[PDB]
Short mmCIF file of N, CA and C and ligand atoms in Angstrom, two decimals:
data_model
loop_
_atom_site.label_atom_id
_atom_site.label_comp_id
_atom_site.label_asym_id
_atom_site.label_seq_id
_atom_site.Cartn_x
_atom_site.Cartn_y
_atom_site.Cartn_z
N UNK A 1 0.83 -1.23 0.00
CA UNK A 1 0.00 0.00 0.00
C UNK A 1 0.85 1.25 0.00
N UNK A 2 1.06 1.80 -1.20
CA UNK A 2 1.86 3.00 -1.40
C UNK A 2 1.02 4.25 -1.16
N UNK A 3 1.30 5.03 -0.10
CA UNK A 3 0.50 6.21 0.14
C UNK A 3 1.19 7.49 -0.32
N UNK A 4 1.85 7.42 -1.48
CA UNK A 4 2.55 8.57 -2.05
C UNK A 4 2.82 8.37 -3.53
N UNK A 5 3.15 9.46 -4.22
CA UNK A 5 3.45 9.41 -5.65
C UNK A 5 4.44 10.51 -6.02
N UNK A 6 5.29 10.24 -7.01
CA UNK A 6 6.25 11.23 -7.47
C UNK A 6 5.80 11.69 -8.83
N UNK A 7 5.68 13.01 -8.98
CA UNK A 7 5.24 13.56 -10.27
C UNK A 7 6.12 14.66 -10.76
N UNK A 8 6.20 14.74 -12.08
CA UNK A 8 7.01 15.73 -12.72
C UNK A 8 6.15 16.60 -13.61
N UNK A 9 6.64 17.80 -13.85
CA UNK A 9 5.99 18.76 -14.72
C UNK A 9 7.08 19.35 -15.60
N UNK A 10 7.00 19.17 -16.92
CA UNK A 10 8.02 19.67 -17.86
C UNK A 10 7.68 20.96 -18.63
N UNK A 11 8.56 21.33 -19.57
CA UNK A 11 8.37 22.53 -20.40
C UNK A 11 7.34 22.35 -21.51
N UNK A 12 6.91 21.11 -21.74
CA UNK A 12 5.92 20.87 -22.77
C UNK A 12 4.52 20.74 -22.19
N UNK A 13 4.34 21.32 -21.00
CA UNK A 13 3.07 21.33 -20.28
C UNK A 13 2.50 19.93 -20.11
N UNK A 14 3.35 19.01 -19.66
CA UNK A 14 2.93 17.63 -19.47
C UNK A 14 3.27 17.11 -18.07
N UNK A 15 2.35 16.32 -17.51
CA UNK A 15 2.58 15.66 -16.23
C UNK A 15 3.00 14.27 -16.69
N UNK A 16 4.05 13.73 -16.09
CA UNK A 16 4.58 12.40 -16.42
C UNK A 16 3.66 11.29 -15.89
N UNK A 17 2.64 11.72 -15.15
CA UNK A 17 1.68 10.82 -14.53
C UNK A 17 0.28 11.26 -14.96
N UNK A 18 -0.51 10.30 -15.40
CA UNK A 18 -1.86 10.56 -15.89
C UNK A 18 -3.01 10.10 -15.00
N UNK A 19 -2.76 9.16 -14.10
CA UNK A 19 -3.81 8.64 -13.22
C UNK A 19 -3.28 8.21 -11.87
N UNK A 20 -3.95 8.63 -10.80
CA UNK A 20 -3.53 8.28 -9.44
C UNK A 20 -4.61 7.49 -8.70
N UNK A 21 -4.20 6.40 -8.06
CA UNK A 21 -5.11 5.56 -7.29
C UNK A 21 -4.70 5.64 -5.82
N UNK A 22 -5.63 6.10 -4.98
CA UNK A 22 -5.40 6.23 -3.54
C UNK A 22 -6.05 5.06 -2.82
N UNK A 23 -5.23 4.22 -2.20
CA UNK A 23 -5.73 3.06 -1.49
C UNK A 23 -6.48 3.45 -0.22
N UNK A 24 -7.62 2.80 0.01
CA UNK A 24 -8.48 3.06 1.17
C UNK A 24 -7.78 2.90 2.52
N UNK A 25 -6.76 2.05 2.57
CA UNK A 25 -6.01 1.79 3.80
C UNK A 25 -5.23 3.01 4.26
N UNK A 26 -4.84 3.84 3.29
CA UNK A 26 -4.08 5.05 3.58
C UNK A 26 -4.90 6.03 4.42
N UNK A 27 -4.25 6.60 5.43
CA UNK A 27 -4.88 7.58 6.31
C UNK A 27 -4.54 8.94 5.69
N UNK A 28 -3.34 9.00 5.11
CA UNK A 28 -2.85 10.20 4.45
C UNK A 28 -2.30 9.79 3.09
N UNK A 29 -2.12 10.78 2.22
CA UNK A 29 -1.57 10.56 0.89
C UNK A 29 -0.64 11.72 0.55
N UNK A 30 0.53 11.40 0.02
CA UNK A 30 1.53 12.42 -0.31
C UNK A 30 1.86 12.47 -1.80
N UNK A 31 2.04 13.68 -2.32
CA UNK A 31 2.40 13.88 -3.71
C UNK A 31 3.70 14.69 -3.74
N UNK A 32 4.71 14.15 -4.42
CA UNK A 32 6.00 14.82 -4.54
C UNK A 32 6.19 15.37 -5.95
N UNK A 33 6.05 16.69 -6.09
CA UNK A 33 6.18 17.35 -7.38
C UNK A 33 7.56 17.94 -7.69
N UNK A 34 8.02 17.71 -8.91
CA UNK A 34 9.31 18.23 -9.37
C UNK A 34 9.15 18.84 -10.76
N UNK A 35 10.13 19.65 -11.15
CA UNK A 35 10.12 20.33 -12.44
C UNK A 35 11.46 20.14 -13.15
N UNK A 36 11.53 19.17 -14.09
CA UNK A 36 12.75 18.88 -14.85
C UNK A 36 12.98 19.84 -16.01
N UNK A 37 12.09 20.82 -16.17
CA UNK A 37 12.21 21.79 -17.25
C UNK A 37 13.33 22.79 -17.03
N UNK A 38 13.48 23.72 -17.97
CA UNK A 38 14.51 24.75 -17.88
C UNK A 38 13.91 26.12 -17.56
N UNK A 39 12.62 26.29 -17.85
CA UNK A 39 11.93 27.56 -17.62
C UNK A 39 11.40 27.84 -16.21
N UNK A 40 11.45 29.12 -15.78
CA UNK A 40 10.99 29.57 -14.46
C UNK A 40 9.46 29.53 -14.34
N UNK A 41 8.96 29.59 -13.10
CA UNK A 41 7.52 29.51 -12.83
C UNK A 41 6.62 30.62 -13.36
N UNK A 42 7.20 31.76 -13.69
CA UNK A 42 6.40 32.86 -14.22
C UNK A 42 5.93 32.56 -15.64
N UNK A 43 6.61 31.64 -16.33
CA UNK A 43 6.24 31.26 -17.70
C UNK A 43 5.90 29.77 -17.88
N UNK A 44 6.44 28.91 -17.02
CA UNK A 44 6.20 27.47 -17.10
C UNK A 44 5.94 26.91 -15.70
N UNK A 45 5.35 27.73 -14.84
CA UNK A 45 5.07 27.29 -13.49
C UNK A 45 4.07 26.15 -13.43
N UNK A 46 4.27 25.25 -12.48
CA UNK A 46 3.39 24.11 -12.27
C UNK A 46 3.06 23.83 -10.82
N UNK A 47 1.80 23.50 -10.58
CA UNK A 47 1.35 23.10 -9.26
C UNK A 47 0.49 21.87 -9.46
N UNK A 48 0.28 21.12 -8.39
CA UNK A 48 -0.56 19.94 -8.44
C UNK A 48 -1.73 20.31 -7.52
N UNK A 49 -2.90 20.54 -8.12
CA UNK A 49 -4.09 20.95 -7.38
C UNK A 49 -5.15 19.87 -7.50
N UNK A 50 -5.78 19.54 -6.38
CA UNK A 50 -6.80 18.50 -6.34
C UNK A 50 -8.21 19.01 -6.01
N UNK A 51 -9.19 18.57 -6.80
CA UNK A 51 -10.59 18.91 -6.58
C UNK A 51 -11.44 17.83 -7.21
N UNK A 52 -12.75 17.88 -6.98
CA UNK A 52 -13.63 16.90 -7.61
C UNK A 52 -13.63 17.28 -9.10
N UNK A 53 -13.88 16.30 -9.97
CA UNK A 53 -13.91 16.54 -11.41
C UNK A 53 -14.94 17.62 -11.73
N UNK A 54 -15.97 17.69 -10.90
CA UNK A 54 -17.03 18.65 -11.09
C UNK A 54 -16.64 20.08 -10.73
N UNK A 55 -15.64 20.25 -9.88
CA UNK A 55 -15.20 21.59 -9.47
C UNK A 55 -13.97 22.09 -10.22
N UNK A 56 -13.35 21.21 -11.01
CA UNK A 56 -12.14 21.55 -11.74
C UNK A 56 -12.20 22.85 -12.53
N UNK A 57 -13.20 22.97 -13.40
CA UNK A 57 -13.35 24.16 -14.22
C UNK A 57 -13.39 25.46 -13.43
N UNK A 58 -14.19 25.48 -12.37
CA UNK A 58 -14.31 26.67 -11.54
C UNK A 58 -13.00 27.03 -10.86
N UNK A 59 -12.31 26.01 -10.34
CA UNK A 59 -11.03 26.23 -9.67
C UNK A 59 -10.00 26.79 -10.64
N UNK A 60 -9.92 26.19 -11.82
CA UNK A 60 -8.99 26.62 -12.86
C UNK A 60 -9.34 28.02 -13.33
N UNK A 61 -10.61 28.24 -13.66
CA UNK A 61 -11.08 29.55 -14.12
C UNK A 61 -10.74 30.66 -13.14
N UNK A 62 -11.09 30.46 -11.88
CA UNK A 62 -10.84 31.46 -10.84
C UNK A 62 -9.37 31.59 -10.46
N UNK A 63 -8.64 30.48 -10.49
CA UNK A 63 -7.23 30.50 -10.16
C UNK A 63 -6.41 31.30 -11.16
N UNK A 64 -6.68 31.09 -12.44
CA UNK A 64 -5.96 31.81 -13.48
C UNK A 64 -6.16 33.32 -13.40
N UNK A 65 -7.28 33.73 -12.80
CA UNK A 65 -7.62 35.14 -12.65
C UNK A 65 -7.02 35.79 -11.40
N UNK A 66 -6.51 34.97 -10.50
CA UNK A 66 -5.91 35.45 -9.25
C UNK A 66 -4.47 35.92 -9.39
N UNK A 67 -3.84 35.63 -10.53
CA UNK A 67 -2.47 36.06 -10.74
C UNK A 67 -1.38 35.23 -10.09
N UNK A 68 -0.14 35.47 -10.53
CA UNK A 68 1.05 34.77 -10.04
C UNK A 68 1.30 34.86 -8.55
N UNK A 69 1.25 36.08 -8.02
CA UNK A 69 1.48 36.33 -6.60
C UNK A 69 0.61 35.46 -5.70
N UNK A 70 -0.57 35.10 -6.20
CA UNK A 70 -1.52 34.26 -5.46
C UNK A 70 -1.43 32.78 -5.85
N UNK A 71 -0.32 32.40 -6.49
CA UNK A 71 -0.09 31.02 -6.93
C UNK A 71 -1.19 30.46 -7.82
N UNK A 72 -1.83 31.35 -8.58
CA UNK A 72 -2.91 30.99 -9.49
C UNK A 72 -4.03 30.18 -8.85
N UNK A 73 -4.40 30.59 -7.63
CA UNK A 73 -5.48 29.98 -6.87
C UNK A 73 -6.32 31.08 -6.23
N UNK A 74 -7.63 30.88 -6.20
CA UNK A 74 -8.52 31.85 -5.59
C UNK A 74 -8.26 31.73 -4.09
N UNK A 75 -7.94 32.85 -3.42
CA UNK A 75 -7.67 32.80 -1.98
C UNK A 75 -8.81 32.10 -1.25
N UNK A 76 -8.44 31.17 -0.37
CA UNK A 76 -9.40 30.41 0.43
C UNK A 76 -10.48 29.66 -0.37
N UNK A 77 -10.12 29.18 -1.56
CA UNK A 77 -11.05 28.43 -2.42
C UNK A 77 -11.41 27.11 -1.74
N UNK A 78 -12.68 26.96 -1.35
CA UNK A 78 -13.15 25.76 -0.66
C UNK A 78 -13.24 24.51 -1.54
N UNK A 79 -13.15 24.70 -2.85
CA UNK A 79 -13.20 23.57 -3.79
C UNK A 79 -11.85 22.88 -3.91
N UNK A 80 -10.80 23.52 -3.39
CA UNK A 80 -9.47 22.93 -3.43
C UNK A 80 -9.33 22.00 -2.23
N UNK A 81 -9.17 20.71 -2.51
CA UNK A 81 -9.02 19.71 -1.46
C UNK A 81 -7.60 19.76 -0.88
N UNK A 82 -6.62 19.89 -1.76
CA UNK A 82 -5.21 19.96 -1.38
C UNK A 82 -4.43 20.47 -2.59
N UNK A 83 -3.23 20.99 -2.37
CA UNK A 83 -2.42 21.51 -3.47
C UNK A 83 -0.98 21.77 -3.05
N UNK A 84 -0.08 21.69 -4.03
CA UNK A 84 1.34 21.99 -3.78
C UNK A 84 1.48 23.45 -4.18
N UNK A 85 2.66 24.02 -3.97
CA UNK A 85 2.86 25.39 -4.38
C UNK A 85 3.24 25.34 -5.87
N UNK A 86 3.24 26.49 -6.52
CA UNK A 86 3.60 26.57 -7.93
C UNK A 86 5.12 26.55 -8.02
N UNK A 87 5.67 25.66 -8.84
CA UNK A 87 7.12 25.58 -8.97
C UNK A 87 7.64 25.82 -10.38
N UNK A 88 8.94 26.10 -10.47
CA UNK A 88 9.59 26.32 -11.74
C UNK A 88 10.78 25.38 -11.88
N UNK A 89 11.53 25.56 -12.96
CA UNK A 89 12.70 24.74 -13.25
C UNK A 89 13.60 24.55 -12.02
N UNK A 90 13.96 23.30 -11.76
CA UNK A 90 14.85 22.99 -10.64
C UNK A 90 14.25 22.94 -9.25
N UNK A 91 13.07 23.53 -9.08
CA UNK A 91 12.41 23.54 -7.78
C UNK A 91 11.56 22.28 -7.58
N UNK A 92 11.08 22.10 -6.35
CA UNK A 92 10.23 20.96 -6.01
C UNK A 92 9.39 21.28 -4.79
N UNK A 93 8.37 20.45 -4.56
CA UNK A 93 7.48 20.63 -3.43
C UNK A 93 6.65 19.38 -3.20
N UNK A 94 6.18 19.21 -1.97
CA UNK A 94 5.37 18.06 -1.61
C UNK A 94 4.13 18.47 -0.83
N UNK A 95 3.08 17.66 -0.93
CA UNK A 95 1.84 17.93 -0.22
C UNK A 95 1.25 16.63 0.33
N UNK A 96 0.80 16.68 1.58
CA UNK A 96 0.18 15.53 2.22
C UNK A 96 -1.21 15.94 2.70
N UNK A 97 -2.22 15.12 2.42
CA UNK A 97 -3.59 15.43 2.81
C UNK A 97 -4.32 14.24 3.43
N UNK A 98 -5.36 14.53 4.22
CA UNK A 98 -6.18 13.49 4.86
C UNK A 98 -7.01 12.75 3.83
N UNK A 99 -6.85 11.43 3.78
CA UNK A 99 -7.61 10.60 2.84
C UNK A 99 -9.11 10.65 3.16
N UNK A 100 -9.45 11.05 4.38
CA UNK A 100 -10.84 11.16 4.80
C UNK A 100 -11.59 12.24 4.02
N UNK A 101 -10.84 13.04 3.27
CA UNK A 101 -11.42 14.10 2.44
C UNK A 101 -11.88 13.54 1.10
N UNK A 102 -11.61 12.26 0.86
CA UNK A 102 -11.99 11.59 -0.37
C UNK A 102 -13.06 10.54 -0.10
N UNK A 103 -13.85 10.23 -1.12
CA UNK A 103 -14.89 9.21 -0.98
C UNK A 103 -14.98 8.36 -2.20
N UNK A 104 -15.46 7.15 -1.94
CA UNK A 104 -15.61 6.17 -2.99
C UNK A 104 -16.62 6.54 -4.05
N UNK A 105 -16.30 6.12 -5.28
CA UNK A 105 -17.19 6.34 -6.38
C UNK A 105 -16.84 7.56 -7.18
N UNK A 106 -16.97 8.70 -6.51
CA UNK A 106 -16.74 10.05 -7.00
C UNK A 106 -15.40 10.24 -7.66
N UNK A 107 -15.41 10.92 -8.81
CA UNK A 107 -14.20 11.17 -9.56
C UNK A 107 -13.47 12.45 -9.18
N UNK A 108 -12.17 12.34 -8.97
CA UNK A 108 -11.35 13.49 -8.64
C UNK A 108 -10.38 13.71 -9.80
N UNK A 109 -9.93 14.95 -9.91
CA UNK A 109 -8.97 15.36 -10.96
C UNK A 109 -7.85 16.24 -10.40
N UNK A 110 -6.62 15.92 -10.77
CA UNK A 110 -5.48 16.74 -10.36
C UNK A 110 -5.10 17.52 -11.60
N UNK A 111 -4.67 18.76 -11.39
CA UNK A 111 -4.32 19.63 -12.50
C UNK A 111 -3.46 20.78 -12.05
N UNK A 112 -2.90 21.49 -13.02
CA UNK A 112 -2.08 22.65 -12.76
C UNK A 112 -2.96 23.85 -13.07
N UNK A 113 -2.92 24.87 -12.21
CA UNK A 113 -3.75 26.04 -12.44
C UNK A 113 -3.04 27.19 -13.18
N UNK A 114 -1.78 27.01 -13.57
CA UNK A 114 -1.09 28.07 -14.30
C UNK A 114 -1.85 28.32 -15.60
N UNK A 115 -2.01 29.59 -16.00
CA UNK A 115 -2.74 29.95 -17.23
C UNK A 115 -2.59 29.01 -18.42
N UNK A 116 -3.70 28.35 -18.76
CA UNK A 116 -3.77 27.44 -19.90
C UNK A 116 -3.24 26.02 -19.76
N UNK A 117 -2.45 25.77 -18.73
CA UNK A 117 -1.86 24.45 -18.54
C UNK A 117 -2.82 23.29 -18.35
N UNK A 118 -3.95 23.54 -17.69
CA UNK A 118 -4.93 22.49 -17.41
C UNK A 118 -5.44 21.70 -18.61
N UNK A 119 -5.30 22.26 -19.81
CA UNK A 119 -5.74 21.59 -21.03
C UNK A 119 -5.09 20.21 -21.13
N UNK A 120 -3.77 20.16 -20.93
CA UNK A 120 -3.05 18.89 -20.98
C UNK A 120 -2.60 18.44 -19.61
N UNK A 121 -2.26 19.40 -18.75
CA UNK A 121 -1.78 19.06 -17.41
C UNK A 121 -2.89 18.72 -16.44
N UNK A 122 -3.44 17.53 -16.62
CA UNK A 122 -4.50 17.06 -15.75
C UNK A 122 -4.49 15.55 -15.75
N UNK A 123 -5.13 14.98 -14.75
CA UNK A 123 -5.20 13.55 -14.62
C UNK A 123 -6.32 13.19 -13.69
N UNK A 124 -6.51 11.89 -13.49
CA UNK A 124 -7.57 11.41 -12.62
C UNK A 124 -7.03 10.91 -11.28
N UNK A 125 -7.83 11.06 -10.23
CA UNK A 125 -7.48 10.57 -8.90
C UNK A 125 -8.72 9.90 -8.33
N UNK A 126 -8.57 8.65 -7.89
CA UNK A 126 -9.68 7.87 -7.36
C UNK A 126 -9.33 7.15 -6.05
N UNK A 127 -10.32 7.03 -5.17
CA UNK A 127 -10.14 6.31 -3.90
C UNK A 127 -10.67 4.91 -4.17
N UNK A 128 -9.81 3.90 -4.05
CA UNK A 128 -10.21 2.53 -4.34
C UNK A 128 -9.61 1.51 -3.37
CU1 LIG B 1 1.75 24.14 -15.17
CU1 LIG B 2 -11.09 5.84 6.05
#
């Protein structure tokens, strides 16, 4: 029972991971994000943000409007279950969250909120 995952975000707006499965036995779950690209976060910044598939659009829409200084997230957005900070080339970050915030059945989606990235930088997350 692996309660963690390592993910990368490159210069071609791609996550090296497309689907995450969170085992029910896990009390917590950790995501380790890295950036193997060459570009800084102001132009190729990446974060790993988690929400229900149904809230993704709103989170992305509102986050992109909040600007860089706010890490492309609406301050105190209740639709955000968990998230890493926005990173650039050479940087990294990790996030751990309570698995009790997830439920069976329901589809979750991880994505980057940097302007336009969510088109390709997204994946699925499920509690199974
Ligand atoms: Cu990004
Ligand atoms: Cu439980």
